[PDB]
Amino acid sequence: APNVVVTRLTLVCESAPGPITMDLTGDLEALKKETIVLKEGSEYRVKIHFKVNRDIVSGLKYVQHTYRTGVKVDKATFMVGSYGPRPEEYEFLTPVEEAPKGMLARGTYHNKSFFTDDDKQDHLSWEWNLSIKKEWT
Ligand SMILES: O=C(N[C@H](c1ccc(-c2ccccc2)cc1)c1cccs1)[C@H]1CCCNC1
């Protein structure tokens, strides 16, 4: 096992009808197929579940790249910090954002996330898709 193990991504949205999450321990190619649904205008946060196993890690960063076909990447970096080893997993949450609204805002966005640190270590790099819809269905 590695020192840092990213286990789960969750979109914390209080107005959502059900859970919006994805297991990050399985196959990484199957993650692209899975599409995450977010109603337009919804307030949300990105939650990263991860474990520290042996030693204190420092300088953790969450890096998120959002792609729409034919558009320049929308980048965002979040400082995660230092964490010590323990059996229970940790939870890092981004600040609240508001998903865009309107027909021009609806559609599927292609995300590539990076859980890394100051040492540019690849704790986990994965792809996932987010669909902005007029309603939750
Ligand atoms: O719509 C915006 N950016 C969008 C976007 C859409 C969705 C996300 C996302 C990804 C992952 C999770 C949650 C949400 C991220 C960005 C675009 C990206 C690339 C080309 S446009 C502006 C307008 C108002 C809201 N703040 C930013």
Please provide the DSSP assignment of the chain as one string.
--SEEEEEEEEE-TT-SS--EEESSS-SHHHHH-EEEEETT-EEEEEEEEEE-SS-EEEEEEEEEEE-TTS--EEEEEEEEEE---SSPEEEEPPPEE---STTT-EEEEEEEEEE-TT---SEEEEEEEEEESS--
Give CA angle at 56 (9, 112), nearest 5°. 30
Q: Is 68 in the pocket of ligand 1 (CB under 6 A)?
A: yes
> Which atom of ligand 1 lies closest to the CA of 72?
20
Whose Cα sits closest to atom 1 in ligand 1? 100
Contacts 24+ apart (CB under 8 A), 119-123: 119/59, 121/4, 123/2, 123/4, 123/5, 123/6, 123/50, 123/60
Whose Cα sits closest to atom 14 in ligand 1? 99
> Which atom of ligand 1 lies closest to the CA of 76?
15
82: nearest Cα among 114, 57, 53: 57
Q: Is 128 in the pocket of ligand 1 (CB under 6 A)?
A: no
The answer to whether 40 touches 103, Cβ cutoff 8 Å, is no
CA of 1 to the centre of ligand 1 (A): 34
CA–CA distance, 46 with 96 (Å, rounded to integer): 8
> Which atom of ligand 1 lies closest to the CA of 67?
19
CA–CA distance, 131 with 66 (Å, rounded to integer): 12
10: nearest Cα among 89, 88, 120, 87: 89
Beta bridge partners of 103: none
CA–CA distance, 85 with 50 (Å, rounded to integer): 11
What residues contact 137, with CB distance under 8 A and at least 6 apart? none
13: nearest Cα among 47, 46, 44: 44
| Phi–psi pair at 55, nearest 5 degrees | -125, 165
CA–CA distance, 36 with 30 (Å, rounded to integer): 13
- 4-133: CATH topology is Coagulation Factor XIII; Chain A, domain 1 (2.70.50)
Q: Is the dihedral of CA 19, 21, 99, 135 positive or negative?
A: negative
CA of 112 to the centre of ligand 1 (A): 13
* Torsion on CA atoms 21, 38, 80, 54, rounded to nearest 10: 10
How was this entry determined? X-ray
